[PDB]
């Protein structure tokens, strides 16, 4: 009678209540399947619910029972009414939590979910970066980099690419001065190891003067540190910088001719 009173409630959609009843009837059927055919299966045609929604409800059943593959198949089945953005978001987040990156990517590629919110963009780029679609991720980032969302997008990309190790791929793209400036600002205050990594990035973009300034800063910093692995790496680094700076253009040569 509680299910029945749902009909007595404010009906936003008869199809919603029909889908609830159909899901309950399917649960009844799978509780004890008797006979290979039933007139209860005739309920959706009796109450005139689209086969699109029928296949959808099948997908909802399968996803609830964690048959994600069959649920995705039923959802991606064509001639199906497109589902709503909230359940897009929950579906994709659950799939990523469960680790079904390929399935979530298939969902996104077929259904083509909407994205007009920073959260939507972050979720979609998360799926794409877990599935190695770095190029399209960066492209849509550039597209939707508003004056309000750009730094959030950058921070999210930095964290997630740090987690799954796409650094050399990322280093091979066209960029902008603001992006590199924000990168430098973020990485400058984030510890020594990030200092040597961004040193590597300077050298990768051929930034030798700045690399040497960072090296001077690190050497000045390491005058009270006493870790032996750090001492090994720092002696290596001192040999490195003595090798490099003397060959570079002459400004640092004049600075070396200057007393220290």
């Amino acid at each position: 009678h509680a299910l029945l009173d749902v009909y007595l409630l404010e009906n936003a959609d008869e199809m919603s209540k029909h889908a609830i009843t159909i899901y309950f009837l399917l649960d009844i059927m799978y509780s004890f399947p008797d006979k290979p055919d039933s007139s209860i299966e005739s309920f959706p045609t009796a109450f005139f619910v689209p086969g699109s929604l029928i296949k959808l409800i099948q997908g909802f059943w399968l996803l609830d029972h964690n048959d994600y593959q069959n649920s995705v198949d039923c959802i991606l089945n064509p001639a199906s009414s497109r589902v709503m953005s909230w359940q897009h978001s929950q579906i994709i987040e659950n799939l990523l939590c469960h680790g079904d990156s390929r399935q979530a990517l298939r969902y996104l590629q077929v259904m083509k979910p909407v994205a007009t919110t920073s959260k939507e963009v972050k979720l979609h780029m998360t799926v794409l970066l877990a599935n190695r679609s770095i190029l399209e991720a960066w492209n849509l980032q550039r597209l939707h980099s508003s004056r309000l969302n750009v730094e959030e997008l950058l921070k999210h990309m930095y964290e997630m690419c740090q987690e799954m190790g796409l650094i050399e791929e990322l280093l091979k793209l066209t960029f902008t001065d603001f992006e590199q400036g924000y990168l430098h600002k973020f990485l400058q205050t984030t510890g020594v190891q990030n200092q040597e990594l961004l040193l590597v990035h300077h050298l990768q973009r051929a930034n030798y003067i700045s690399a040497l300034q960072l090296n001077q800063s690190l050497k000045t910093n390491h005058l009270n540190d006493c870790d032996r692995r750090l001492r090994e790496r720092s002696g290596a680094r001192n040999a490195i910088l003595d090798q490099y700076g003397k060959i570079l253009p002459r400004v640092q040569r004049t600075l070396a001719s200057e007393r220290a």
């Binding site: 089945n77 064509p78 001639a79 590629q109 083509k112 679609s133 399209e136 990768q204 051929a206």
Partner: protein, 251 residues
């Protein structure tokens, strides 16, 4: 045979009216339906709705022996029936000719190509080529950066320098900084510069400017002095005299 005859007799309008009457109650051959509906869309000039029709069609192709034949139009690999779908649709896209539709279809198709790295290289190569054809050279470069296959890399580098010269945007290739590659690029450019005539362009001054870009005074001076050498060997005009003067000047 009904839909086959609607194709044959050019009855495209009859086609869409048929398929619209059939689809919502007929949940078989839906991929084919989306197919030839997209065919009419490209025919009339709404190939983007055509692309979405193919996007929805790619989900189920397993049945309809007619459809299965289109997996047999792309044999040798079975990474995904979606992937043979992708190869066939890209083949028709190259037969007919919307490069940007190809571009986005591929940026999507990267998902179903999980294996056979030759396919990945060829697809990003095609991305590169279309980006250049429309001048989208920045993300042409970006697409190239994921090509490790050195043979395709050499083909792309040769066609790259060719189109860069044709369009006079070499300086961008230089404005891109890199690591450990000037050996490659100098090999390519000198291979071209020695092979071609000097009066088309001073690829020597080109490389000299690169030398300036790379702070290499030794090699720069040598390049400019040797170009003065070449001019003195070749031409004997007073304009040329000023030119070798400038050459030795810069050296």
């Amino acid at each position: 045979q009904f839909a086959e005859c609607l194709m044959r007799n050019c009855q495209y309008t009859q086609l869409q009216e048929y398929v619209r009457l059939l689809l919502p109650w007929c949940q078989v051959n839906v991929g084919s339906c989306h197919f030839m509906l997209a065919q009419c869309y490209l025919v009339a000039g709404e190939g983007h709705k055509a692309l979405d029709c193919f996007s929805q069609a790619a989900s189920e192709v397993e049945r309809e022996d007619f459809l299965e034949k289109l997996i047999r139009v792309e044999e040798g690999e079975s990474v995904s029936p979606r992937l043979q779908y992708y190869n066939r649709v890209l083949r028709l896209l190259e037969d007919v000719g919307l490069p940007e539709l190809v571009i986005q279809l591929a940026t999507i198709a990267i998902s179903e190509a999980s294996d056979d790295w030759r396919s990945q290289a060829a697809l990003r190569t095609r991305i590169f080529k279309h980006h250049l054809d429309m001048g989208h050279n920045s993300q042409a470069y970006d697409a190239l950066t994921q090509i490790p296959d050195t043979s395709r890399q050499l083909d792309c580098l040769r066609q790259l320098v060719v189109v860069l010269c044709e369009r006079s945007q070499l300086q961008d290739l230089v404005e891109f900084p890199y690591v450990n590659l000037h050996n490659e690029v100098v090999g390519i450019i000198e291979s071209r510069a020695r092979a071609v005539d000097l009066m088309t362009h001073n690829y020597y001054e080109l490389l000299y400017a690169f030398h300036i870009y790379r702070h290499n005074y030794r090699k720069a001076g040598t390049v400019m002095f040797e170009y003065g050498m070449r001019l003195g060997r070749e031409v004997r005009t007073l304009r040329g005299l000023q030119k070798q003067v400038n050459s030795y000047l810069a050296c």
